[PDB]
Amino acid sequence: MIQRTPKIQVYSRHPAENGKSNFLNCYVSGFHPSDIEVDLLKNGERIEKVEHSDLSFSKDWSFYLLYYTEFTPTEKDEYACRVNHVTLSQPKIVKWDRDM
């Protein structure tokens, strides 16, 4: 119909400093249809306390959602975003990079 593949950014709200509390965001943009799955992963294990923004869309009619949870970053722990959409032949994992 128009199926449009999602674009995923994984970042943090503030510059990441270990032991200092922050927020992990996952920003999925430019997809279509709206029905999408977005898990925030702490060490390959799925976070449950995960909030997300209200369904909105850009002027080309493709949607954007900001999933976010609280996180205290460390140097050993690994965070990622698991996005799944009809246009993904299999779920797409995007690791959190401290400088991206």
Partner: protein, 276 residues
């Protein structure tokens, strides 16, 4: 110093499952202030910004009314869509509408918007003259000849140039600190020695409102679209935005590269250079 108020609705049919889900959000500039959800318990139009909360129970009653009735109208405008396109009752389908209005520095109306999109593609849109339609394909041309016969553009034009513009001027005052702050971007560079003959400079721009920000790179003043990566402006979560732009540079020539952050919270544009 012009402003904008936008309203984005999404009907997603769920055949076999429930009634069609309806989500709807309202923005002044890049600040959402309301939302409504047909799957929500409250069944009310809700607030999502401080400055809207200070609005009477009169307001929330009437806003819940119109959103609840766009709810039902767009449910049938999906059923119509099927008959138009001869489509199986089986399929989930998306009908988005966008309406809004721009004001300038002064507060005079500048432009109205009202339009639709079936399944990701344009359907119909109100043109700038506020007196004619743009029918994307041939089904939309049914709606066009019908919304023309019914002088529907007239009716929109009375909200757009009137009621819409009013709410914009109002919202813009009730919340004149959220919506009329221009928080400037916070800048700093980073440096990751990749291979042992290359490096990466990343230009960071954090904590800004509004979202519109320009970040270009320059090798000797000449702008560089070449070994560059520029991530979409993105939300931070608290209403500030962040973007970054980064370049692969030959190792040693770090300071042949300058970064150029141009935001409106900045008096002059920002030049940035490496420097340990």
């Amino acid at each position: 110093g012009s402003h904008s108020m936008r309203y984005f609705s999404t009907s997603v049919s769920r055949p076999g499952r429930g009634e069609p889900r309806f989500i709807a959000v309202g923005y002044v500039d890049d600040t959402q202030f309301v939302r409504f959800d047909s799957d929500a318990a409250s069944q009310r139009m809700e607030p999502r910004a401080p400055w809207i909360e200070q609005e009477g129970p009169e307001y929330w009653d009437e806003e819940t009314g119109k959103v609840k009735a766009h709810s039902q109208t767009d449910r049938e405008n999906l059923r119509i869509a099927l008959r138009y396109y001869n489509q199986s009752e089986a399929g989930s389908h998306t009908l988005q509408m966008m309406f809004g209005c721009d004001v300038g520095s002064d507060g005079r109306f500048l432009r109205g918007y009202h339009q639709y999109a079936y399944d990701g593609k344009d359907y119909i849109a109100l043109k700038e003259d506020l007196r004619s339609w743009t029918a994307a394909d041939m089904a939309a041309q049914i709606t066009k000849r019908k919304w023309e016969a019914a002088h529907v553009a007239e009716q929109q034009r009375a909200y757009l140039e009137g009621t819409c513009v009013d709410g914009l001027r109002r919202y813009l005052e009730n919340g004149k600190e959220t919506l009329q702050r221009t928080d400037p971007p916070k800048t700093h560079m980073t440096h990751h020695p990749i291979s042992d003959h290359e490096a990466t400079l990343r230009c960071w721009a954090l904590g800004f409102y509004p979202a519109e920000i320009t970040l270009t790179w320059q090798r000797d003043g000449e702008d560089q679209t070449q070994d560059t990566e520029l991530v979409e402006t993105r939300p931070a979560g608290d209403g500030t935005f962040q973007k970054w732009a980064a370049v692969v540079v030959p190792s040693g020539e770090e300071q042949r590269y300058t970064c150029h952050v141009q935001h409106e919270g900045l008096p002059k544009p920002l030049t940035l250079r490496w420097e340990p």
